């Protein structure tokens, strides 16, 4: 167990537990410091740390020491004995809190027992030397007034009070002659500058600080955790594993980049969580190797140590026994020490991945920041840690007896206000970047607010080096993970070996390197005329001396006038916000504008399913103008085109090394060693793939996800600036009224802020999801594929390398050279799927990833869409698309393939996507419109099959072809085996649902079947179990290829490919999404138009048509004529028959050219009666359920309704539409719907029933029924002449 000593600052010096110490950096000169032994080998010196600092630097100045910290200065801290005593008692309390749990007590025990090796690199291997500044420190025994008498002591840690900056805690190691014992396996006395009262503050982006922007937000740190973070650094230094290696350095070439010190892997390991993932596997191993090497040196020393020249009283055996336990070396029955790989591995992982801030925080139930790379905030002062009502050893601030245990409420700034005090900004110094324009106006931006973008030099290029393979050679993976549970239950973790006595010979060689620090300017001026995120956010603020502002959508005006504030919300929102009303209408106006704010903010949940984008926050570009000028034009469109990439402030240059070649070792005659080499190179190959992915993840996290983090913080600030502006306006307008008026105004400012704040929180959740999705998108589509390219290349090189090796050994391999030759083929055949969980166990990140992978739309690997009279791939995988001159394109995303040789599209797919899942798993979906057969060309139509889409590579692939009325899907595996599935529509139907009409096709392939779906319905199925590997990523050629008629053509739309099998549910949904439109459609499925001649079709009376009756103003209903020739293969009813109708628009007298008919439009239904245009009317005064419609010349009669409202009552896809007669646009009095009715006629000569073009109220209730009745007589379709249909 660990004993924490007790004492008061004024207690007498006893030369044992309370001494007068001579600090290492004092170089054995100057005065001593009263020090207190809080525990064995650990000392507390309650005084400011002054080594390397100038006296005046303890005062706040125009300078700063660290560019990424809001530095608090206070030269009076610890300036009285009572202050010193408070420091002591507080440290005692923190140590008690630390040991209050197993994890912490073990951290302390490891630190107490991790005594520094007696010596360093300059010491002979056969000796212990205690006479060096990193091992021995002196204490003054003599009387006060002379250094006459001193005594030496061994020590592990010396904790001082803070340096100039109170909130800048730091652990320092001792260097001598440019080297550090704590970095070379020996370990050495560690020092620390620490402050328990002024703690750091943080806030989670993906979360919310008690959902209160108007209230204080964020959480303050538990000083016990801050202390344990530093203790972890001490631990590393004591075990001599605080090694340096390739650091993460920030790119600082652009003005928007954040500047900071290089970050060592040891720092990221100490924090834990996701940060270790920013350290690539290559570097993880480099560090591992360096430490192991450090330990080999120590173990050899233990085998060679014979004497201690500096202190004859040192018992060699005791130290050899202690160091053996410290480093976990093993010892044979003779006394020979050696390294036990298993024990070293466990110790290393325990020290680097077990004891971490994140792991300890979780164990002690203390909240901390999400990552090392997260904006730092201004610190706060803790009022009284010594007050058990505010802070306890058992629970810290999160005291259950105060219901502050749940959700870390004790650390919540908005909640536990009695626990802290804000800091005077006058004592704070922050490094700012002054962005000046070439004129002039200047904006100050805190360095913390900028973009942290790791420089390419941050990553190791070790993957480019050659690797020698041997029967020995084994895989090398370092799991940046360690089960904290076992560490806590490790029976032999903590040493049970005697701790040597601390007294020793006084130090006489005070040689040591003392760091020298100095402030740098707190403001750096840079010049740029750019108006990016910083400028846009600034335009949303106003000075403190101003109280009357007005919102504006003009960014430039906002920057120009102090009373003008920029808003990225709607034009309507802005106008309403600046509206001034009378006291009597003020309350109403407040409810209105606040409600509008919520609505505007809520637009963050906008969907864009037609573009295959489930979520889009449309106003982000207007809000920040981040990345590639996202404020100009329409953001949604720009995002559909370029995706996540447009939001990035900078596109990183990735390090993706050409993997080094393998050198296999030969073993002639030795059948085994040769086979082993083959197998080792294979398993090693997988290590390269994994290591490569690791390199990608590290770069994504430190160059890309960091940028997206800044965008999220920016949006949080933007939304708050918007709410603050509105609150300012509301206050101003309210305060213009007199006190008498105010009394009668019903307003609650707390509720206002409550509703605004809630709207913000909802928007933040949406924005967080949107941005995280973008980040993962970039990783998967813009990073991973580039790594796959190199890994695939590597595989090929290694493939020929292995086979060739199997040849040169052909003899020594006898009857197996072939078995292990295919062994290579089948191994290098299957590639390693990328799984982020392998490189990190951060819940937030893993969840982001899993979310992304659960969205079927991310399985889209090809999505050809129209943009600027051209077809391009919007899948994000960058397929190259060449559309040749013979292809016709329109903005309705329709494209036509004709019989011309140049009517072709060439698509070159991305070869770096896991498409070939080995068992064949993918889908193709598209809309198509196939013209009707030519009546005198029916033989060739039914006989000649022609390809329309062909995708082959090495004689393997797939293709879509057509033979008359049949569409065919064909697969051809690597062997040449073939399988087909097809859908054939009938060509003898009176009225067909498919011939020359747009319909939706979807083909899915899995291990077992090949299925064809038509309009969401499964139509065909073919077992493709026997079919082997199918190469599907060759060039896709869209072109009619076969013995076709020169008049043959095909229309297509929305062609897309999924690298997964779509479910019937996914397909149904896609069908409905792509079928959706604000406008009605014609019979062929094209947009319905005004001023276009159409024959009319009735879904409830298919074979009937309308004809103006000869002697009367009515529409008689007749039977359609039919195909008359004698072919046995075809039959149909004529479609171009009956009156030629034409839809005219009612509103806006913009003439009668042409235009799109939209649902709910008011129209006139006319038709041509020879050289005249007649109209369809309804006699106003009928009392029966229905009546015959009145067809006559155009005119305006008081007795007839002439206005029709075109409707769509069906909620499901249909080309049918309905026609409604209402008393007038405004009223809700429905006359009825246009349909067909049967009448009985009995005259002098004829008796029979006849149908007429009518209007009936009966349809009004029927169209409400579910499912929609498609057979209703009020369902009409408009048929215009079309080249795809001849009769
Ligand atoms: Zn640290
Ligand atoms: Zn940062």
Swiss-Prot record:
Chain residue ranges for the region called N-terminus of receptor binding domain (N-RBD): 854-1075
Motif Host ganglioside-binding motif, residue range(s) on this chain: 1256-1259
Protein name per the record: Botulinum neurotoxin type B
Note accompanying the cofactor annotation: Binds 1 zinc ion per subunit, to the LC.
Gene Ontology molecular function: lipid binding; metalloendopeptidase activity; protein transmembrane transporter activity; toxin activity; zinc ion binding
Residues in coiled coil: none
Outcome recorded upon mutating residue 1237 to W: Greatly decreased toxicity, heavy chain has decreased binding to synaptosomes and dramatic decrease in GT1b binding
Stretch list, region Translocation domain (TD): 440-853
Family: Belongs to the peptidase M27 family.
């Amino acid at each position: 167990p660990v004993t924490i000593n007790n004492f008061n600052y004024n207690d007498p010096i006893d030369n044992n537990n309370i001494i007068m110490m001579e600090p290492p950096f004092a170089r054995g000169t100057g005065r001593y410091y009263k020090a207190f032994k809080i525990t064995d080998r650990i000392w507390i010196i309650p005084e400011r740390y002054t080594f390397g600092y100038k006296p005046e630097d303890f005062n706040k100045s125009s300078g700063i020491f660290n560019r990424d910290v809001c530095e608090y200065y206070d030269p009076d801290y610890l300036n009285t004995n009572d202050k010193k005593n408070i420091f002591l008692q507080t440290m005692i309390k923190l140590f008690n809190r630390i040991k209050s749990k197993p994890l912490g007590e073990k951290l302390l025990e490891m630190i107490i027992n991790g005594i520094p090796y007696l010596g360093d690199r300059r010491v002979p291997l056969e000796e212990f030397n205690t006479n060096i500044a990193s091992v021995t420190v002196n204490k003054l025994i003599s009387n006060p007034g002379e250094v006459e008498r001193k005594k030496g002591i061994f020590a592990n840690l010396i904790i001082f009070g803070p340096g100039p900056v109170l909130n800048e805690n730091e652990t320092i190691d001792i260097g001598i002659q440019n080297h550090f014992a704590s970095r070379e396996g020996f370990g050495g006395i560690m020092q620390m500058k620490f402050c328990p009262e002024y703690v750091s503050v943080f806030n989670n982006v993906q979360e919310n600080k008690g959902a209160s922007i108007f209230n204080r937000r964020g959480y303050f740190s538990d000083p016990a955790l801050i202390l344990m973070h530093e203790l972890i650094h001490v631990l590393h230094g004591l075990y001599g594993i605080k090694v340096d290696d390739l650091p993460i350095v920030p790119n600082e070439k652009k003005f928007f980049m954040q500047s900071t010190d290089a970050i060592q892997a040891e720092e990221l390991y100490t924090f834990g969580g996701q940060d270790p993932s920013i350290i690539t596997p290559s570097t993880d191993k480099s560090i591992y190797d360096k430490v192991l090497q450090n330990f080999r040196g120590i173990v050899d020393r233990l085998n060679k140590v014979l004497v201690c020249i500096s202190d004859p009283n040192i018992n060699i055996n005791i130290y050899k026994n202690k160091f053996k336990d410290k480093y976990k070396f093993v010892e044979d029955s003779e006394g020979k020490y050696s390294i036990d790989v298993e024990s070293f591995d466990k110790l290393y992982k325990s020290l680097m991945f077990g004891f971490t801030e994140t792991n300890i925080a979780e164990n002690y139930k203390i909240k901390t920041r999400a990552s090392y790379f997260s904006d730092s905030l201004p610190p706060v002062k803790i009022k009284n840690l010594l007050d058990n009502e505010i802070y306890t050893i058992e629970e810290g601030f999160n005291i259950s007896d105060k219901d502050m245990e749940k959700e870390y409420r004790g650390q919540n700034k908005a909640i536990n206000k009695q626990a802290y005090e804000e800091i005077s900004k006058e004592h704070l110094a922050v490094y700012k970047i002054q962005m000046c324009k070439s004129v002039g106006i200047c904006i100050d931006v805190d360095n913390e607010d900028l973009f942290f973008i790791a420089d390419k030099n941050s990553f190791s290029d070790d993957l480019s080096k050659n690797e020698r393979i041997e029967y020995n050679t084994q895989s090398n993976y370092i799991e940046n993970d360690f089960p904290i549970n076992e560490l806590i239950l490790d029976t032999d973790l903590i040493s049970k070996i005697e701790l040597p006595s601390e007294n020793t010979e006084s130090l006489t060689d005070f040689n040591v390197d003392v760091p020298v620090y100095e402030k740098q300017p707190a403001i750096k001026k840079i010049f740029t005329d750019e108006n990016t995120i910083f400028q846009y956010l600034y335009s949303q603020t106003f000075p403190l001396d101003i109280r009357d502002i007005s919102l504006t959508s003009s960014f430039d005006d906002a920057l120009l006038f102090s009373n003008k504030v920029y808003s990225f919300f709607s034009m309507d929102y802005i106008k309403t916000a600046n509206k001034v009303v009378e006291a009597g209408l003020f309350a109403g106006w407040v409810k209105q504008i606040v409600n509008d704010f919520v609505i505007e903010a809520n637009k963050s949940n906008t969907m864009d399913k037609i573009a295959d984008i489930s979520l889009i926050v449309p106003y982000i570009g207007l809000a920040l103008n981040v990345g590639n000028e996202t404020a100009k034009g329409n953001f949604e469109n720009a995002f559909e085109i370029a995706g996540a990439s447009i939001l990035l402030e900078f596109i990183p240059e990735l390090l993706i090394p050409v993997v080094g070649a393998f050198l296999l070792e030969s073993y002639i005659d030795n059948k085994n060693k040769i086979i082993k080499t083959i197998d080792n190179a294979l398993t090693k190959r997988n290590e390269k793939w994994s290591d490569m992915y690791g390199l990608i993840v590290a770069q994504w996290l430190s160059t890309v996800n960091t940028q997206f983090y800044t965008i999220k913080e920016g949006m949080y600030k933007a939304l708050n600036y918007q709410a603050q502006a509105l609150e300012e306006i509301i206050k101003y307008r309210y305060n213009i009224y007199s006190e008498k008026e105010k009394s009668n105004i019903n307003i609650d400012f707390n509720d206002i802020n409550s509703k605004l704040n809630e709207g913000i929180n909802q928007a933040i959740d949406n924005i967080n999801n949107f941005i995280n999705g973008c980040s993962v998108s970039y990783l998967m589509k813009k990073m991973i594929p580039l790594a796959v390219e190199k890994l695939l290349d590597f595989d090929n090189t290694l493939k020929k390398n292995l086979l060739n090796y199997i040849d040169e050994n052909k003899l020594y391999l006898i009857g197996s050279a072939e078995y292990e030759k295919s062994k290579v083929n089948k191994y290098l055949k299957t590639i390693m799927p990328f799984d982020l969980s392998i490189y990190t166990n951060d819940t937030i990140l893993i969840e982001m990833f899993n979310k992304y992978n659960s969205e079927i739309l991310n399985n889209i690997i090809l999505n050809l869409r129209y943009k600027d009279n051209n077809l391009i791939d919007l899948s994000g995988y960058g397929a190259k698309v060449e559309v040749y001159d013979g292809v016709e394109l329109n903005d309705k995303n329709q494209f036509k393939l004709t019989s011309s040789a140049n009517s072709k599209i060439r698509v070159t797919q991305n070869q770096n996507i896991i498409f070939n899942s080995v068992f064949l798993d993918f889908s193709v979906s598209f809309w198509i419109r196939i013209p009707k057969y030519k009546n005198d060309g029916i033989q060739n139509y039914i006989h000649n099959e022609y390809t329309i889409i062909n995708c082959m590579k090495n004689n393997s692939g797939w293709k879509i072809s057509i033979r008359g009325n049949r569409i065919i899907w064909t697969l051809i595996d690597i062997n040449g085996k073939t399988k087909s599935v097809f859908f054939e529509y009938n060509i003898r139907e009176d009225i067909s649902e498919y011939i020359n009409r747009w319909f939706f096709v979807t083909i899915t392939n899995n291990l077992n079947n090949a299925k064809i779906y038509i309009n969401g319905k499964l139509e065909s199925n073919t077992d493709i179990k026997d079919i082997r590997e199918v190469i599907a990523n060759g060039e896709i050629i869209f072109k009619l290829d076969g013995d076709i008629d020169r008049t043959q053509f095909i229309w297509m739309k929305y062609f897309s490919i999924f690298n997964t099998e779509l479910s019937q549910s996914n397909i149904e949904e896609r069908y409905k999404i792509q079928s959706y439109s604000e406008y009605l459609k014609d019979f062929w499925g094209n947009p319905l138009m005004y001023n276009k001649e159409y024959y009319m079709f009735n879904a409830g009376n298919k074979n009937s048509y309308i004809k103006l009756k000869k002697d009367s103003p009515v529409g008689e209903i007749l039977t359609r004529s039919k195909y008359n020739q004698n072919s046995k293969y075809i039959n149909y009813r004529d479609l171009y028959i009956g009156e030629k109708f034409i839809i005219r628009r009612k509103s806006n007298s913009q003439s009668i050219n042409d235009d799109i008919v939209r649902k709910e439009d008011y129209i006139y239904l006319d038709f041509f009666n020879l050289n005249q245009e007649w109209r369809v009317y309804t006699y106003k005064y009928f009392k029966k359920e229905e009546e015959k419609l009145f067809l006559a010349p155009i005119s305006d009669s008081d007795e007839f309704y002439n206005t029709i409202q075109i409707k769509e009552y069906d909620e499901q896809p249909t080309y049918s539409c309905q026609l409604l007669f209402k008393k007038d646009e405004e009223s809700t009095d429905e006359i009825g719907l246009i349909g067909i009715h049967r009448f009985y006629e009995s005259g002098i000569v004829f008796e029979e029933y006849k149908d007429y073009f009518c209007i009936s109220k009966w349809y009004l209730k029927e169209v409400k029924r579910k499912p929609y009745n498609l057979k209703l007589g009020c369902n009409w379709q408009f048929i215009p002449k079309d080249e795809g249909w001849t009769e």
